[PDB]
Design an enzyme around this catalytic site. Sequence first.
Site, short mmCIF file in Angstrom:
data_model
loop_
_atom_site.label_atom_id
_atom_site.label_comp_id
_atom_site.label_asym_id
_atom_site.label_seq_id
_atom_site.Cartn_x
_atom_site.Cartn_y
_atom_site.Cartn_z
N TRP A 84 0.87 -1.28 -0.07
CA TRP A 84 0.00 0.05 0.08
C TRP A 84 0.61 1.32 0.12
O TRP A 84 0.59 2.24 -0.20
CB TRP A 84 -0.93 0.10 1.31
N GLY A 120 -7.61 6.56 3.46
CA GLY A 120 -8.18 7.30 4.26
C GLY A 120 -7.94 8.74 4.18
O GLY A 120 -8.01 9.51 5.01
N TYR A 131 -3.62 -2.00 -8.38
CA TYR A 131 -4.70 -1.34 -9.23
C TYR A 131 -4.12 -1.37 -10.50
O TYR A 131 -4.85 -0.63 -11.62
CB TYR A 131 -4.49 0.16 -8.74
N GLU A 200 -12.49 2.05 -3.41
CA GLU A 200 -12.51 1.22 -2.15
C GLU A 200 -12.12 2.07 -1.02
O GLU A 200 -11.53 2.97 -1.31
CB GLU A 200 -11.50 0.00 -2.24
N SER A 201 -12.84 1.86 -0.08
CA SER A 201 -12.59 2.57 1.45
C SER A 201 -12.91 4.26 1.16
O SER A 201 -13.71 4.62 0.61
CB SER A 201 -11.09 2.13 1.89
N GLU A 330 -13.87 -6.50 8.03
CA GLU A 330 -13.45 -5.18 7.75
C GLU A 330 -12.56 -4.79 8.89
O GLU A 330 -11.90 -3.70 8.73
CB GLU A 330 -14.81 -4.36 7.68
N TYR A 333 -7.93 -5.68 10.42
CA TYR A 333 -6.60 -4.74 9.84
C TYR A 333 -6.48 -3.60 10.71
O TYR A 333 -5.19 -3.70 11.11
CB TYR A 333 -6.99 -4.38 8.31
N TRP A 435 -0.97 -11.74 5.89
CA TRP A 435 -1.69 -11.34 7.36
C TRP A 435 -1.90 -12.78 7.96
O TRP A 435 -2.22 -13.68 7.37
CB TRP A 435 -2.58 -10.51 7.31
N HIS A 443 -9.92 -6.04 5.30
CA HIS A 443 -10.02 -4.82 4.47
C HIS A 443 -9.12 -4.63 3.47
O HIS A 443 -7.91 -4.69 3.63
CB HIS A 443 -10.05 -3.48 5.40
#
Lengths: 538, 528
Positions: A84, A120, A131, A200-201, A330, A333, A435, A443
């Site tokens: 990310w 966020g 992506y 997303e998010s 969700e 994470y 994870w 998420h």
Amino acid sequence: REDAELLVTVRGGRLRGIRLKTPGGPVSAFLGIPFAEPPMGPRRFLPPEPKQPWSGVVDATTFQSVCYQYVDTLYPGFEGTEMWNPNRELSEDCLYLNVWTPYPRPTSPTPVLVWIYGGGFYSGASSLDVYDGRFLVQAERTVLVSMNYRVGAFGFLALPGSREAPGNVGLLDQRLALQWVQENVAAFGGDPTSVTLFGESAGAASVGMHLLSPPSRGLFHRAVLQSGAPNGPWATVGMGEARRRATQLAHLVGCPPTGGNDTELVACLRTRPAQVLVNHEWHVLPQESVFRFSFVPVVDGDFLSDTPEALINAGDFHGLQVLVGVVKDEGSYFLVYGAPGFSKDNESLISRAEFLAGVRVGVPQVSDLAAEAVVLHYTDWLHPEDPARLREALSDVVGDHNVVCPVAQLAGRLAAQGARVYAYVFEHRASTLSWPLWMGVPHGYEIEFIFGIPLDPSRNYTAEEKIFAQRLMRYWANFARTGDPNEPRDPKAPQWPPYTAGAQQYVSLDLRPLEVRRGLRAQACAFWNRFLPKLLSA
Amino acid sequence: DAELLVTVRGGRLRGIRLKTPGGPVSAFLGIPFAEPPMGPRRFLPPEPKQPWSGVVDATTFQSVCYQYVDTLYPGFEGTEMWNPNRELSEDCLYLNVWTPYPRPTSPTPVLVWIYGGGFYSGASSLDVYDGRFLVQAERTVLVSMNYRVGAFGFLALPGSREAPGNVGLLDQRLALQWVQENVAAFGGDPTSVTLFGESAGAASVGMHLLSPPSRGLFHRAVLQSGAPNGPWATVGMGEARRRATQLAHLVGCPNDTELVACLRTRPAQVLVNHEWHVLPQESVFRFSFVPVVDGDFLSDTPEALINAGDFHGLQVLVGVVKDEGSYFLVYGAPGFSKDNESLISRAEFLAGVRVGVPQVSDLAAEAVVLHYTDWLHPEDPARLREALSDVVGDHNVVCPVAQLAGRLAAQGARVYAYVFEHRASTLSWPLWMGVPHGYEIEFIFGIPLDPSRNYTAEEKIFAQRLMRYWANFARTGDPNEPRAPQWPPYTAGAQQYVSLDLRPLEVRRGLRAQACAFWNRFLPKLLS
Ligand SMILES: *[C@@H]1O[C@H](CO[C@@H]2O[C@@H](C)[C@@H](O)[C@@H](O)[C@@H]2O)[C@@H](O[C@@H]2O[C@H](CO)[C@@H](O)[C@H](O)[C@H]2NC(C)=O)[C@H](O)[C@H]1NC(C)=O
Ligand SMILES: *[C@@H]1O[C@H](CO[C@@H]2O[C@@H](C)[C@@H](O)[C@@H](O)[C@@H]2O)[C@@H](O[C@@H]2O[C@H](CO)[C@@H](O)[C@H](O)[C@H]2NC(C)=O)[C@H](O)[C@H]1NC(C)=O
Ligand SMILES: *[C@@H]1O[C@H](CO)[C@@H](O)[C@H](O)[C@H]1NC(C)=O
């Protein structure tokens, strides 16, 4: 000399792209197209200006820079976090978008998917591996567009009322890109009359805000909201709180050497190096939380004429088709980013006192009475101290409050007020997922299937996962083409029914065929959506 | 017959021999234990009965204390079984003693029964409280008293001597003192007295637990479907003053001394006719005059008193029926009747909640509707019926009893808990009511052994079981029979209780634990 497929003329001038190899064959990519003047120097915090026309050929042949943002260092060199993080250098010069199109260029107008990343509102980039639009474009013959937009202070610091930092400019970046798609996507064989937003998010929240903002609403036709909603508690902020945050950031970087004339304050902010703002932005939050979201869209009457909640309730959504969903877990994470007792590297079997402490962090800025209500609702009073159960419950608290219930409320109100809505829960845990097992399907981890990443030979997904990825890409492209994810003309395939406020039907997405189910955490979300706001008034 | 002649401190008594399918029993019915609380004595503490010459005739039940008579379903068995079965009178302070025949010659453990009826009704003479079967089967002495109810027992002008409140509770205490002084004359052991009571009778028992002058008058306690911390069971000083004052106004009375003097001139029946409309709101409950917290009988609220108490050395049996709330719904919850299925609509459900849970804020009511709605079936009539039953039963009976059990156990008491889950083959209420409030009593008293009644053979065996658990508890503080699946104590953690039905004891966990978290833990924080 040259290849005509890789050459295109858009209103601003000429572009040259690259031919991309995909397992199913070639795709044309134009990566790194400028769509705004660089928001540098005096243009920091301001609305984006359209890119001025150019002579000669711009090489759109690689992803441009990532907008300035905090870089996650929680688990260094760990794939689960690093996937990310920025994969290009940080620059304030970041307003570029990307177009992927089939090779050769479509000959009749083709449906367009526009991707808005999450993070966020403080991070993210259109250039992340996950992506990558080459697989969707090849498999489904759509055009795919993604843009970069400013995040953090650079995109959302607001001194409401002022002309020098009006706030929401990150959303204005997204809008400019959308305008660009209208004016130019035809040149790539795309159909400006069939544009589907998806994100997303924070990206989903952005999609939703374009739904509720009339000047955006004209630029697209259908919408997909993955694991996020504009009515999420983290997604907007009031004029006052925005100003307090803008002002505190200024103060922390020595600006006005607190408050005062806005023009002076912003000019002082413009003289600070980008990296300095980024370094202090974690300080401006009122409460310790797991949601590091200092600067986010502001409700100021302009982009949003009222809170998203209000706008949703008052709106007529006839002639709108929407696809919405969430992952199975969700909340998990977010817990390793602050909640006491949590780590990716053990079982995170928390104590009751750790659970109570986690509720305040996972649900910041609610009264003690509200927190008590949460603890009551999520405690199993036949097993009040079972660590495994407390872990699960806290994951549900964070997930329900921040994602699932905002999404369910959006889905319900939209369906009831004219929209055709489709809903899903994504339940497959990737074989490649790094994870721990107790996090379930976290998420963010449906994106890589939507973008068809498992078809990448260098990746080690199973063959079933490739088949599954192809199913999801098919649903999304079906929805983009027709407003309905269902296979047009396929009958023996299980059917995905619309979500309605009454039956509340949704499908589960995993390796097994579609299973129809009822209610998006219905009992839980009645608490967050129906009761808790009444407790806020009294 | 010498067995039927007894001398108590007050004088001589003549009792009666009763028959049962298991043999005879001696009964002394209608023994006076107080001076008749009439004229100037209305609203006052009971005075001990002054000695008499000659022989009191104690062969028949005495008068029922003045009370409202239920006319919701005239002639219906399900309601008439609770109505007065003797004439009304303010001259009603009598108690009853059943004992084995011939009278025991060694100290026999004593059970003392306190009836319920919302503190506005009830009588020790109802058929369903007949002591003969318990006494024959389990060889205990059984005592039941009448106490004043409605305004006659609980009208309070706090501070005044003319109407101090709680005198109906004092009637109960005086009878307990009577038992201390006289039960030995019947073969009873004053050092082994167990109090049991249902509903307001159970709340009464709990109140005696929490009031030191009563606590020396008994040793063990049974609380059936009621608790002193119930939201209907007490009233604050101010609200008691208001209700008294409103009664006075409704019957045409105008200084506490002056007010009480005028009330004392009114025929009993006149007070009864107006007692219903002194309540602050419409409710399925008719509970105008109840025990008042005034620092005397109760030095604090039962909630406070329970939290602060050392209960080491106490053993308590507590329990509920499977469907506590259903019975009350036909007394004013919109859409309800015993004669149809009572399949209500959501609007009726919302209305019902305000009636089953009176005098709480809109915010509080919303929370109730949230908790008890199935949001996958928010409008299913059957589910709504069931949930409104749950609401009323939880709020009024199950969660107050659960809270009492948890606190007592966590503060030294040994607690046994049950849920009573048998629907009587003879039950005259509709099937949708399940096992309603009050319908364990007939089994505890062994009424199914009465051959003139129509219970099954399985039901008679069941009653015998329940009589044995109850007498076991009275004798030892432990209901268990020899090793039979065992009945474990109730603890705030494990929360175990047993189901009482035709099957053997099944051990289970939690008395509506999720629901009672709402009523007992959250809702109080809200009202702050
Ligand atoms: C589970 O992990 C957390 C996080 O601690 C880190 O990660 C672990 C996997 C392990 O590598 C630890 O050495 C790391 O420090 C533990 O919570 C921490 O506990 C320590 C010691 O008590 C404390 O100083 C920290 O403040 C705690 N951090 C948080 C966020 O609470 C937790 O105790 C671990 N559970 C175990 C080991 O059973
Ligand atoms: C179930 O009955 C209730 C109670 O009504 C009474 O009992 C019935 C069996 C019947 O004999 C009625 O005549 C009685 O009034 C019904 O609720 C009543 O509905 C009527 C309809 O107009 C209304 O006027 C009354 O006020 C209602 N009473 C109460 C207490 O709410 C209810 O409708 C019945 N359920 C059905 C028919 O499905
Ligand atoms: C802020 O200062 C600038 C600097 O000259 C001035 O032009 C402007 O009027 C001031 N703003 C306001 C609102 O007065």
